[PDB]
């Protein structure tokens, strides 16, 4: 399988320079005719194309950001790099790399095929901060007609994103991780919630896994009902 993966800084102070990387697997840039683009999506906004690099090292750039963009290649490490200078709060976004592949023996067909998972970039003067994680304990007040809710409250972290699985190894059916909201304090908060059978609530362990890559923190919180 071919795969692309973005990495780079998650936080860049305004006016500073962003370097993002797209590593490829399953084929070798160095030997292929494919193009590679960078595309970004600010939260709640449309996709915007940024830059493209062809196999031969020709390059195109979005006219309105050209002066601040550089796309380049490192074929010994199988990467494609984006440098973006003078970062601005309006540049906070998910950045994706996408491949434009060729199909047919003679090279008859091209179109973008694979995109990376994306990487979240935030432009801000604020420091990085790890989350505190708190149980949302199941009770009769969090139950209705054979169904019970419990959760984790993931709070006081910066910047985005946090990932939350359930059970040290994702289990699902009724898992809801709410989009984060930026608090009054300027830190993010969110809840992740799961609904389960209410009459097997005390048979089962529910231990929520929180990872915040920017700060290096990983937390596992045992969520137990009761107090008294």
């Amino acid at each position: 399988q071919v795969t692309l993966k973005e990495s780079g800084p998650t936080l860049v102070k305004p006016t500073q320079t962003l370097t993002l990387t797209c590593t490829f697997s399953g084929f070798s840039l160095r030997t292929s005719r494919v193009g590679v683009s960078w595309i970004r999506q600010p939260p709640g906004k449309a996709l915007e194309w940024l830059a493209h690099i062809y196999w031969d090292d020709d390059k195109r750039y979005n006219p309105s950001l050209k002066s601040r963009l550089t796309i380049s290649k490192d074929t010994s490490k199988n990467q494609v790099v984006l440098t973006m200078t003078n970062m601005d709060p309006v540049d906070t976004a998910t950045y994706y790399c996408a491949r434009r592949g060729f199909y047919g023996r003679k090279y008859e067909v091209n179109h973008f095929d694979y995109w990376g998972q994306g990487t979240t970039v935030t432009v801000s003067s604020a420091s990085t901060k790890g989350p505190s994680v708190f149980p949302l304990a199941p009770s009769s007040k969090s139950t209705s007609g054979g169904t019970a809710a419990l959760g984790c409250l993931v709070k006081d972290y910066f910047p985005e994103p946090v990932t939350v699985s359930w059970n040290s190894g994702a289990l699902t059916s009724g898992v809801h991780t709410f989009p984060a909201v930026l608090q009054s304090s300027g830190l993010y908060s969110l809840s992740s919630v799961v609904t389960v059978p209410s009459s097997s609530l005390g048979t089962q362990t529910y231990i929520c896994n929180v990872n915040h890559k920017p700060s290096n923190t990983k937390v596992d919180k045992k969520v137990e009902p009761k107090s008294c």
Binding site: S37, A46, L47, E48, W49, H52, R60, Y61, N62, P63, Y96, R100, V109, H111, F112, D113, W115, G116, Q117, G118, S132, F134, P135, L136, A137, S139, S140, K141, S142, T143, S144, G145, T147, A149, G151, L153, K155, G174, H176, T177, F178, P179, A180, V181, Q183, S184, S189, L190, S191, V193, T195, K226, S227, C228
Partner: protein, 229 residues
């Protein structure tokens, strides 16, 4: 330059029904080589967009028969013949013939589905958080449709404003529902001045409002357990 418009931006559709999206470009997107590089994507919430159609009308592999594209020149159409639950998300058309390559503004498809009341749950602050000097009370409206909902907070029977905040998930791709959290935000001290914390949910699926509440520092009655030695 080269502008891409989509119509409409919000598309409500009853499952099993046809659906149709427009994508017009302000000048021809026919590449000099003769080909028209028109691509359509489906983006699921917080996730990487996935290619449906390329070259105007060619369905990418793994993409179900119900998806098809058409038009030419400046006029384009994505057609879904039989809308499923799995098709919810945001659709984008993308011209990749001309620099700068451009995407349309995106069309959110919504499943028109069928009415469902929210389940209402409430969660007091944990002792852990109280420890650090903040209190967060979470109310939870699970698995409802449609989106519109009114969640009101009452602390010792007074209506709160300005200290709560909502967060909504996207339409579930399997059941077509939403879920929403409302979080009450207070200092530990303000939290301790009061006893009854109440979350009040109104929704066109419930016949009258449902309230859920608890009393600070007390275990609820339904949660009776015998004492130990």
């Amino acid at each position: 330059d080269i502008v891409m418009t989509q119509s409409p931006l919000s598309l409500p559709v009853t499952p099993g029904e046809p659906a149709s999206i427009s994508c017009r470009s302000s000048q021809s997107i026919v590449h000099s080589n003769g080909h028209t590089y028109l691509e359509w994507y489906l983006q699921k919430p917080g996730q990487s967009p996935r290619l449906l159609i390329y070259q105007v009308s060619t369905r990418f592999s793994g993409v179900p028969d119900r998806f098809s594209g058409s038009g030419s020149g400046t006029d384009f159409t994505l057609k879904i013949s039989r809308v499923e639950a799995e098709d919810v998300g945001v659709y984008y058309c993308f011209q990749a013939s001309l620099v700068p390559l451009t995407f349309g503004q995106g069309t959110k498809l919504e499943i028109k589905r069928t009415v469902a009341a929210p389940s209402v749950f409430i969660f007091p602050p944990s002792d852990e958080q109280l420890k650090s000097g903040t209190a967060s009370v979470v109310c939870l409206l699970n698995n409802f449709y449609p989106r519109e909902a009114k969640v009101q907070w009452k602390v010792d029977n007074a209506l709160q404003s300005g200290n709560s905040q909502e967060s909504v998930t996207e339409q579930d791709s399997k059941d077509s529902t939403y879920s929403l959290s409302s979080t009450l935000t207070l200092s530990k001290a303000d939290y301790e001045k009061h006893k009854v914390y109440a979350c009040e949910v109104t929704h066109q699926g419930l016949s009258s409002p449902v309230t859920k509440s608890f009393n600070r520092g007390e275990c609820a009655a339904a949660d009776y357990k015998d004492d130990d030695d």
